[PDB]
Design a protein around this ligand. Structure first.
Ligand SMILES: C[C@H](Nc1cccc(Cl)c1Cl)C(=O)Nc1ccc2oc(-c3ccncc3)nc2c1
Ligand SMILES: C[C@H](Nc1cccc(Cl)c1Cl)C(=O)Nc1ccc2oc(-c3ccncc3)nc2c1
Ligand SMILES: C[C@H](Nc1cccc(Cl)c1Cl)C(=O)Nc1ccc2oc(-c3ccncc3)nc2c1
Ligand SMILES: C[C@H](Nc1cccc(Cl)c1Cl)C(=O)Nc1ccc2oc(-c3ccncc3)nc2c1
Ligand SMILES: O=c1[nH]cnc2c1ncn2[C@@H]1O[C@H](COP(=O)(O)O)[C@@H](O)[C@H]1O
Ligand SMILES: O=c1[nH]cnc2c1ncn2[C@@H]1O[C@H](COP(=O)(O)O)[C@@H](O)[C@H]1O
Ligand SMILES: O=c1[nH]cnc2c1ncn2[C@@H]1O[C@H](COP(=O)(O)O)[C@@H](O)[C@H]1O
Ligand SMILES: O=c1[nH]cnc2c1ncn2[C@@H]1O[C@H](COP(=O)(O)O)[C@@H](O)[C@H]1O
Ligand SMILES: [K+]
Ligand SMILES: [K+]
Ligand SMILES: [K+]
Ligand SMILES: [K+]
Lengths: 354, 354, 354, 354
């Protein structure tokens, strides 16, 4: 027979990709009440966070105020690189002056990125994130390897982003201290549409973990998360931390401009590959928009960790390491409709559901 | 090969979960006209109802008036536990003073729940429902077992909620007289979203029944039901009764406040894990809302049992026990669209379809 | 392993049901241009129609004017039975007085239905349709068998409706001259929702045909059709004719009341199991509504047969009998979106697409 | 067992058809930055384009201005045939007078189409496109074969449209220099709805390529494309070029009338099988509408090629021939929702996403 989906090559369509809305965690036998769950997890090989959450390296999400707030809440911020090197380094210093808090900073690849990285290290950064649209190439692997060789002793080096097992494996071989996963799932991202390229985020995590976990390298699940439950799903798929843009962009600490329209409150949120971000040869792979204002970061993080704690209680996971062993059930569109509230008019805002 | 959905573990995504909108009952050879169908079914091992329906233990669904009405209609109510012990016990007495009608009452786990249970038994309750978000743990199993040991002679003890075969089996082993199934399907429930945890309700029923039916323990299908046909589906999947919140919350007998907006009529309906219910450490797993007013309970129950009777006629099921042996066909989104009315503007309200 | 969808019984969920929007006909080698296609097909064992279309036996679709128009267009009407026996018989006579045109009439089961049938035969009806919600029972089979024994010589006897192979086989064994398929697909039908019972219409046809075709008994595909392409699909699945309600209810010849609202034109269309039809013990299994006015029947039939002719050209089918051998490809929701016009604002009405 | 979808014939439903929104390209190891990608590709056996894009032969898409613009941008236009032969030939001459640019022209089948073809060849056309709704028949195959025999030396001859392996193979055997694929995917097309016939476009490409690629015959993927990413998908499925209607109809160079409604700007765009096009025996297989105005063609083509270049960078494809070897992952509806921007209000127009 021909392949059921066309042509004669069984490997042309190589797998079925799932994302967060395709799966649910199965409850299991539990001696863990949400209050007693330990939410700590490895950000990188050497760095463990109290709360397994980091803020996106975006000019509408993370600058010093967000980095400070995230660290105090037990996570970490990654300072964006859409600003001069001296300014990014200064923001690292600001976070460092606020109580020796952990902080990360994004860099690109090449000579200017090298100088940026060295200035960030001098400023006391804890984590360098080599942050690129496509990490599966010699330029990114060389950057990760060279950084580890030169400053690896004082700084952890993260590489990303990937969406496959082989790209995750290449980053592991280059010496990455963590691997960041996500090609296209971002709320403001058009990569999958403009280039046609990506992998659904749950499958991308499962695949990257298949390479990283046996090598003891933590995986950061970056993009596509919209609810506390999605964080539990990402970790159960094998990630060690989750990176958030949209969920944090509406908070007081995000550096986006505060917007008032139709008697409502918003903040700007835009892709770093949007036309506006690139200006402030490649065609854009993001859009510019706004998200509703969500109040203080601390309260958002509390709701997110609370949802994670519930998941740990339901699945009998005393630690994140046990949560990573939980099982999924795949669901249909009807299952998804059933999972959200349905057939009711919401009359009151919930702090963890809008 | 890697698993088609990612990673190398075939059991990571353990099954495909179906819910009501994913399946239809197949018609079969029949000598049963709807009028002659026997809708009676076991609520628990010792208690058989004339109509296999019970009202949810929620502060917007079941208080004494609902409990009285449900019992008179041939089902039963489960009195909610969001009120002082003396008041819940008093409501049991009110139902009991109205003609020796059957009544159930929810309790939690722990010392206060124990005192509540003893007061309810003293008041003459027929069924205690140990009613928890997650029953697969020693606390709930111990509560069920201790209740059966102490008052098991005069009261039936139900345990819930579960969504897996193993959790249903644990409750059976603890001595449960029925097992209640449903993690996340409720109309006002956000568990699946906030915690990421659950199982689509048809599969959850099939799995629980695989453990309960061979032990002679009835399964209560709790949550997610929106039409009379869904009740037939739940029973065919193997449940013995169905528990309803949304479908009954809009009735005259529900204790929710009656609301007038936009020239229309509603009643409040809220999750017992909503912020408003919890107040009146855990983050909410429900929302607060309203549902349209549906009139007297009796008329709603008549329409629901009528739909069930039709299903029994179509499937050749003279009893609920035979309905539990019916077969399903799985359907696609197109099948679902075809099942509901389509391509027509409804001009008149139907008593059993809105 | 447990069954992937739950429980331990592989046959509990017995198959995957497809309907019209799930499939497309594959083009094939062709020496048939649409103009040369022969659209004739068996309505029953003895009766062949020029156009393989019949109008539904509904009080908002078929009375004498529709029956006359359908016959003149090369199809047939089935006169509804929601009126006194003498009136239904009179309408048969009216059609018969209009040029010896073919006509059918619906009857139920039991004594009154028997008298109705005899009066219809006396009036010259060509086809009796034993027309019931569920045909898989002794009452319907006996009616079909008795009618064939008593008047089978002068009248063709159709039985319906079924949605399974075994029910189709029972009707064949009872002596049915055609078998009508459709449990729940109707536009105004709530059977699948109220009772939870049915089978998606393409699979229902495939299954019924598996029983009827080897016995030389034509299958009438009844309900769910919305476009000319759906007719081609039904016939390719193995049906010999298609029965239409919605598509014909908006025509001038339908007996529904003509409605003017919002500067637009509609006609009433209602299920025969709607509360309004039943009045003019069972709960309703239909709704009451309206459909847009579509003009003269002849023009609608021309567009429908034109679409069928195109399908025959694409599939290389010179006759309906060859069309019944065509192949399908199954499609996804994306495939369905692609099939309809997309990403364009329609500015002009098309005669065969709204 | 019966076939899981109904009946006893395993080949009745022959395969599962995918289209663009069902798949994503997997990133791969890459030494190709978008800037260095070579986007050139074969239009036909003898003609290679700098940009693998051609404009649809439609009266609202391609006349001389569009043909000139496409050629200058490195693609080609196919002049439509809904106008007198002398006028179509004149437009060929106009394009030819503008710098020896490449140009194609559509013809039908039969005597008038033959005269049209000869006049187009005399006028200097580079490519004749035998352009029919259904190419799998002797009339079209004879036309292709006769054209190749008579003028094959000076002109390339394309045949279409097909949606199957066997029809593609027949065109290859007839001597086609390229095969054009697409039955029903067009934005303005109702073929799949009116006739019920077609195949989802990715599967159609895979199937046609299975016949054409081993014979060295390029495949033109015609219809259904809405984003730059879709072009990358079509080429990865094995096509050598993509034909665009909707994406180009809104450009300044399209010959559609410019429309002003609601303070917005549109241009007319209609199917060539719409009632309006056919007039200016068959029932229509297209609709008439409008699309938003998109500005100069050059800027649209730049955005489209930019997206393609990104895909080549992500997949490590230095040439289109390597892109044709890329792998897909199949996605679910959740995956598709995740791929587009989600959970954000777009506040600024993006040049490559609306
Ligand atoms: C314009 C786009 N921006 C972008 C995309 C995803 C996420 C974020 Cl945060 C951003 Cl700012 C991009 O970098 N696109 C892009 C698209 C494809 C690329 O391929 C290679 C590359 C680099 C080195 N060797 C081989 C390939 N680099 C590429 C860059
Ligand atoms: C806040 C939430 N409320 C809720 C959830 C579902 C339905 C209803 Cl009616 C309600 Cl009121 C809840 O109880 N969440 C929750 C979430 C996870 C839990 O895990 C354990 C637990 C208890 C004892 N041992 C182990 C785990 N208890 C848990 C409780
Ligand atoms: C009320 C409903 N009406 C209806 C349903 C489908 C299509 C149409 Cl046109 C109509 Cl008017 C109906 O007849 N429901 C119904 C529902 C289930 C039934 O089971 C049996 C039956 C009859 C004889 N033996 C066994 C079962 N008869 C049944 C009748
Ligand atoms: C009316 C329709 N128009 C149309 C359809 C698809 C795309 C475009 Cl651009 C157009 Cl203008 C059409 O040509 N329909 C149609 C539909 C089925 C046909 O079958 C044969 C045919 C021709 C020669 N031998 C056998 C079959 N020719 C057929 C033509
Ligand atoms: O413009 C872009 N194109 C593609 N991805 C982006 C772009 N900007 C940010 N991202 C990614 O999207 C993530 C945020 O996704 P979110 O949490 O779903 O909003 C970031 O952490 C980046 O990985
Ligand atoms: O806040 C909550 N979170 C989760 N489930 C709830 C909550 N409150 C009530 N439930 C469940 O939802 C069921 C009612 O679902 P419904 O019939 O779909 O509205 C109840 O019987 C409980 O099992
Ligand atoms: O009230 C009803 N309930 C269920 N089916 C109905 C009812 N009334 C008519 N039908 C069926 O629906 C068909 C018409 O479907 P339509 O062509 O999709 O509108 C009829 O030919 C009957 O088989
Ligand atoms: O009326 C029609 N019916 C069917 N297909 C059409 C019709 N007119 C144009 N087409 C096809 O649709 C393609 C354009 O599709 P689009 O790029 O999705 O708008 C053309 O290149 C033709 O192959
Ligand atoms: K829910
Ligand atoms: K229906
Ligand atoms: K289309
Ligand atoms: K996205």
């Amino acid at each position: 027979d021909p392949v059921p989906t066309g042509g004669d090559d069984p490997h042309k369509v190589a797998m079925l990709g799932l994302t967060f809305d395709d799966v649910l965690l199965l409850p299991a036998a539990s001696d863990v009440v949400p209050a007693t769950a330990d939410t700590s997890s490895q950000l990188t090989k050497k760095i463990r966070l109290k709360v397994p959450l980091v803020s996106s390296a975006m000019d509408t999400v993370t600058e010093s105020r967000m980095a400070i707030a995230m660290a105090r809440a037990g996570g970490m911020g990654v300072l964006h690189r859409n600003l001069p090197v001296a300014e990014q380094a200064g923001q690292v210093e600001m976070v460092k002056r606020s109580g020796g808090l952990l902080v990360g900073a994004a860099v690109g690849v090449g000579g200017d990125a090298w100088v940026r990285a060295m200035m960030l290290v001098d400023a006391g950064v804890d984590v360098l994130v080599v942050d690129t649209a496509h990490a599966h190439n010699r330029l990114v692997l060389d950057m990760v390897g060279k950084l580890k060789s030169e400053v690896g002793d004082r700084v952890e080096v993260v590489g990303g982003n990937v969406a496959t097992r082989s790209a995750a494996a290449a980053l592991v071989d280059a010496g990455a201290d963590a691997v960041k996963v996500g090609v296209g799932p971002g709320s403001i991202c058009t990569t999958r549409v403009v280039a046609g390229v990506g992998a659904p985020q749950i499958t991308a995590i499962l695949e990257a973990v298949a390479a990283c976990r046996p090598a003891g390298v933590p995986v950061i699940a970056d993009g596509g998360l919209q609810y506390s439950g999605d964080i539990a799903k990402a970790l159960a798929a094998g990630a060690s931390t989750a990176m958030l843009g949209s969920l944090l962009a509406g908070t007081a600490e995000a550096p986006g401009e505060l917007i008032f329209v139709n008697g409502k409150q918003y903040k700007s949120y835009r892709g770093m590959g949007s036309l506006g971000a690139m200006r402030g040869k490649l065609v854009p792979e993001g859009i510019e928009g706004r998200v509703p204002f969500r109040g203080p970061l601390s309260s958002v993080i509390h709701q997110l960790t609370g949802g994670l704690r519930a998941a740990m209680g339901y699945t009998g996971s005393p630690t994140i390491e046990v949560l990573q062993q939980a099982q999924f059930v795949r669901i249909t569109p009807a299952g998804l409709k059933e999972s959200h509230p349905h057939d009711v008019a919401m009359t009151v805002e919930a702090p963890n559901y809008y």
